[PDB]
Amino acid sequence: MRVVVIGAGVIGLSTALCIHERYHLDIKVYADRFTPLTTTDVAAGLWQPYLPQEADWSQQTFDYLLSHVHSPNAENLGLFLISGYNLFHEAIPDPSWKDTVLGFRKLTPRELDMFPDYGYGWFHTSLILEGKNYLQWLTERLTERGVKFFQRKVESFEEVAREGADVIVNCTGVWAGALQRDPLLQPGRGQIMKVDAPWMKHFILTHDPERGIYNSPYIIPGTQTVTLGGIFQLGNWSELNNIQDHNTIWEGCCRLEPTLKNARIIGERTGFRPVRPQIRLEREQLRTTEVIHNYGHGGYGLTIHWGCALEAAKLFGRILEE
Amino acid sequence: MRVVVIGAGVIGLSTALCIHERYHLDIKVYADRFTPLTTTDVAAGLWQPYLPQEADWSQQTFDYLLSHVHSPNAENLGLFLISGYNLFHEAIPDPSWKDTVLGFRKLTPRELDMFPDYGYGWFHTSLILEGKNYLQWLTERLTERGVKFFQRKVESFEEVAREGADVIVNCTGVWAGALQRDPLLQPGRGQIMKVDAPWMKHFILTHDPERGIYNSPYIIPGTQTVTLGGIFQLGNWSELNNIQDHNTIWEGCCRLEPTLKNARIIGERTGFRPVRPQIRLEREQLRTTEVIHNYGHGGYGLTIHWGCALEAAKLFGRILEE
Numbered sequence: 001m002r003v004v005v006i007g008a009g010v011i012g013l014s015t016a017l018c019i020h021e022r023y024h025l026d027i028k029v030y031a032d033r034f035t036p037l038t039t040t041d042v043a044a045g046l047w048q049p050y051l052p053q054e055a056d057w058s059q060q061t062f063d064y065l066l067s068h069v070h071s072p073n074a075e076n077l078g079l080f081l082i083s084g085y086n087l088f089h090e091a092i093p094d095p096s097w098k099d100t101v102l103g104f105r106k107l108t109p110r111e112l113d114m115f116p117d118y119g120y121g122w123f124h125t126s127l128i129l130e131g132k133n134y135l136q137w138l139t140e141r142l143t144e145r146g147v148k149f150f151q152r153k154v155e156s157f158e159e160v161a162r163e164g165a166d167v168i169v170n171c172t173g174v175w176a177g178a179l180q181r182d183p184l185l186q187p188g189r190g191q192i193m194k195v196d197a198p199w200m201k202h203f204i205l206t207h208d209p210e211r212g213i214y215n216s217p218y219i220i221p222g223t224q225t226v227t228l229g230g231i232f233q234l235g236n237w238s239e240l241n242n243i244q245d246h247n248t249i250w251e252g253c254c255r256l257e258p259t260l261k262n263a264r265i266i267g268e269r270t271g272f273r274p275v276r277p278q279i280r281l282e283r284e285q286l287r288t289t290e291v292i293h294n295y296g297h298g299g300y301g302l303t304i305h306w307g308c309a310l311e312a313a314k315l316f317g318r319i320l321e322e
Numbered sequence: 323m324r325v326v327v328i329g330a331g332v333i334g335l336s337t338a339l340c341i342h343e344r345y346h347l348d349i350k351v352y353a354d355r356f357t358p359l360t361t362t363d364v365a366a367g368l369w370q371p372y373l374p375q376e377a378d379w380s381q382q383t384f385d386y387l388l389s390h391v392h393s394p395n396a397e398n399l400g401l402f403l404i405s406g407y408n409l410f411h412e413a414i415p416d417p418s419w420k421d422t423v424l425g426f427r428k429l430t431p432r433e434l435d436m437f438p439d440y441g442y443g444w445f446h447t448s449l450i451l452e453g454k455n456y457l458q459w460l461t462e463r464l465t466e467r468g469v470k471f472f473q474r475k476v477e478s479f480e481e482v483a484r485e486g487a488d489v490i491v492n493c494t495g496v497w498a499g500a501l502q503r504d505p506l507l508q509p510g511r512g513q514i515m516k517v518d519a520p521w522m523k524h525f526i527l528t529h530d531p532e533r534g535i536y537n538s539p540y541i542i543p544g545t546q547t548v549t550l551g552g553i554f555q556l557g558n559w560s561e562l563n564n565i566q567d568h569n570t571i572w573e574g575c576c577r578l579e580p581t582l583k584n585a586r587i588i589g590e591r592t593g594f595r596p597v598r599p600q601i602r603l604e605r606e607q608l609r610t611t612e613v614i615h616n617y618g619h620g621g622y623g624l625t626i627h628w629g630c631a632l633e634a635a636k637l638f639g640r641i642l643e644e
């Protein structure tokens with residue numbers, strides 16, 4: 001078959017590779033934005049879903065990454081173990097992923113004292129898959145397998161069909177609604193700044209919806225820099241860093257972790273989470289040619305990508321046997 | 323009184339400051355080596371004692387540091403939280419410091435799989451007090467209080483006495499045996515290399531005495547670099563980096579953590595742990611003038627320093643009331 005994948009973020013590339021592996025075929029990746037200009041490049045890269053099928057896709061992804069975490073290749077993947085805190089106010093039940101992450105537990109009283117404003121929470125060990133390095137890795141692997149890349153903006157699936165493609169794999173993310181309307185797909189705008197604070201060895205996530213849910217400070221160490229954030233604005237399309245939000249993050253994070261006050265700011269990026277009540281991963285026969293939708297991963301695309309890639313490949317198989 | 327402290331490592335400076343605070347006096351620090359040329363500068367700086375009174379001195383130190391850990395000043399102290407692994411073979415009982423460290427526990431099966439060679443171990447959250455930055459901090463504080471510093475090599479306590487000093491506080495560390503013989507004081511030579519591997523967010527200590535006890539690999543992340551080590555050579559006085567030991571560390575640590583293979587080596591230092599069956603913290607009236615010995619902290623001087631400083635100050639009081 002003649003395959004075309006639309007999208008060169010984590011979903012698009014993970015899918016293309018994951019299919020190429022199951023079945024070997026002419027695979028072409030089309031996207032209007034490649035690294036470091038994708039939403040994937042913005043993300044801190046913490047494995048952790050938000051609060052039915054999806055749990056297994058996440059859990060598949062975790063184990064897959066956990067396999068690679070202690071091999072020499074991991075540096076090029078931008079993958080590493082990291083333990084950290086989740087902070088709430090009222091106590092709430094353990095997550096679905098309790099047993100998926102390494103060494104999950106409830107915070108002791110002594111730990112909770114370190115965060116004056118929060119009274120209940122977790123500690124666990126997870127991973128970070130840094131978007132930048134993962135896409136370079138996925139791209140180097142796809143290129144090794146003769147998967148050709150072209151930079152171009154697709155105006156319709158029909159456009160791609162006329163070219164002579166048997167299967168279209170649509171991993172356009174938040175921009176999907178252009179190619180086929182979907183009012184369930186809303187952009188959940190977020191903004192982060194990358195600061196220099198190497199003493200930070202743990203991630204810290206908070207859960208305070210006073211500003212609208214997910215407008216609450218978080219600190220997520222990376223390799224070179226530390227990601228500061230906590231902005232989630234449904235409906236905002238402004239791909240522009242914003243001063244009001246810049247301060248909101250800075251203030252929020254400084255209160256959590258005062259040591260951060262004298263940390264040099266290295267950068268700041270805006271990106272859009274492709275939010276949808278559930279992910280859209282399903283087959284579809286085009287009006288005028290098969291389509292696999294794989295978009296709407298919200299704020300957990302790196303967390304869940306690999307499970308989605310396999311499920312897309314198993315969908316790609318289901319079509320090849322027709 | 324006219325006070326003189328001998329030593330400008332963690333013990334010497336912590337003691338001088340800790341006394342200046344309890345009682346306010348003319349305090350002078352004498353030492354032949356100041357930063358970054360002290361044994362204190364070599365140490366990774368992990369809080370963790372080795373395996374009766376001493377437990378409380380350690381525990382005093384921990385809490386004292388834990389107070390400072392979330393204040394803005396901490397960066398200048400070189401102090402930060404860090405979680406990590408201790409790896410053994412045969413299972414052994416929990417340590418005295420179980421309840422002192424944050425969130426102590428036994429490793430789950432799934433965690434133990436990440437270290438093929440080890441079958442039992444711990445996980446806990448501790449701190450790192452980086453020797454370099456702590457001494458700059460202690461020195462800036464002591465200077466703020468008009469504590470004058472002089473670089474000079476003391477040949478005898480009698481030498482210092484004739485100058486006209488009422489109390490001598492001897493924090494000479496491993497070189498103490500020159501000023502007063504002590505065959506219980508042996509140098510426990512160690513060597514470490516500082517590599518560049520920022521993805522390392524946890525410390526890892528191992529316990530395999532095949533090469534003599536404490537000749538076993540360890541990885542201890544710092545702020546800017548990661549400390550690699552595991553050398554403990556009783557009786558060796560060679561202040562010289564050694565190629566056989568350089569490789570031993572490199573090999574040992576690479577087996578624990580393969581990701582480390584392609585990590586650029588930033589530096590390498592040799593230092594001597596002042597080993598003694600127990601610490602020598604006690605008062606003594608000189609032959610020809612009072613002395614407080616405070617030396618022999620082995621591989622846990624940063625871990626225990628503050629408890630030792632307070633106990634030395636309480637000893638300094640006991641003398642002032644005479």
Ligand SMILES: Cc1cc2nc3c(=O)[nH]c(=O)nc-3n(C[C@H](O)[C@H](O)[C@H](O)COP(=O)(O)OP(=O)(O)OC[C@H]3O[C@@H](n4cnc5c(N)ncnc54)[C@H](O)[C@@H]3O)c2cc1C
Nearest residue numbers: 007008009032033039040043045046154173190301302303
């Ligand atoms: C600020 C922020 C922080 C985040 N942090 C985390 C985190 O810590 N952990 C986590 O798991 N997730 C996180 N996420 C979520 C994660 O970043 C996204 O879910 C993920 O990057 C989406 O992957 P994607 O491939 O669907 O989208 P994208 O990475 O946006 O890729 C979309 C691709 O499709 C292409 N494309 C789209 N439309 C067209 C078209 N019409 N024609 C041609 N090409 C097209 C684009 O050029 C691009 O190549 C975060 C998101 C944001 C915004």
Ligand SMILES: Cc1cc2nc3c(=O)[nH]c(=O)nc-3n(C[C@H](O)[C@H](O)[C@H](O)COP(=O)(O)OP(=O)(O)OC[C@H]3O[C@@H](n4cnc5c(N)ncnc54)[C@H](O)[C@@H]3O)c2cc1C
Nearest residue numbers: 329330331354355361362365367368476495512623624625
């Ligand atoms: C390789 C290595 C790694 C380590 N890692 C850790 C760790 O992770 N955590 C931890 O808690 N501990 C660690 N330690 C232990 C710690 O480094 C020491 O216990 C501690 O630094 C000793 O402090 P000190 O002030 O006694 O000695 P030093 O720091 O050696 O200071 C001694 C001072 O006395 C002066 N002096 C000595 N004799 C004389 C004299 N005759 N005249 C004038 N001045 C004199 C010296 O100039 C110097 O200023 C480590 C040690 C080594 C060697």
Ligand SMILES: O=C(O)CCc1cc2c(-c3ccccc3)cc(=O)oc2cc1O
Nearest residue numbers: 048049050051190206214215216230299
């Ligand atoms: O999506 C992101 O911006 C970061 C990744 C991430 C975030 C959460 C958040 C969250 C979001 C915004 C502000 C505060 C907390 C809550 C949550 O429950 O899960 C998350 C998982 C993630 O991977």
Ligand SMILES: O=C(O)CCc1cc2c(-c3ccccc3)cc(=O)oc2cc1O
Nearest residue numbers: 370371372373512528536537538552621
């Ligand atoms: O003293 C040092 O060199 C590091 C600090 C340190 C080490 C231990 C070690 C050790 C020592 C050498 C090789 C492997 C393990 C064993 C141990 O049980 O406790 C330690 C505490 C420390 O602060």
Ligand code: NA
Nearest residue numbers: 112115116118
């Ligand atoms: Na609290």
Ligand code: NA
Nearest residue numbers: 434437438440
């Ligand atoms: Na094991």
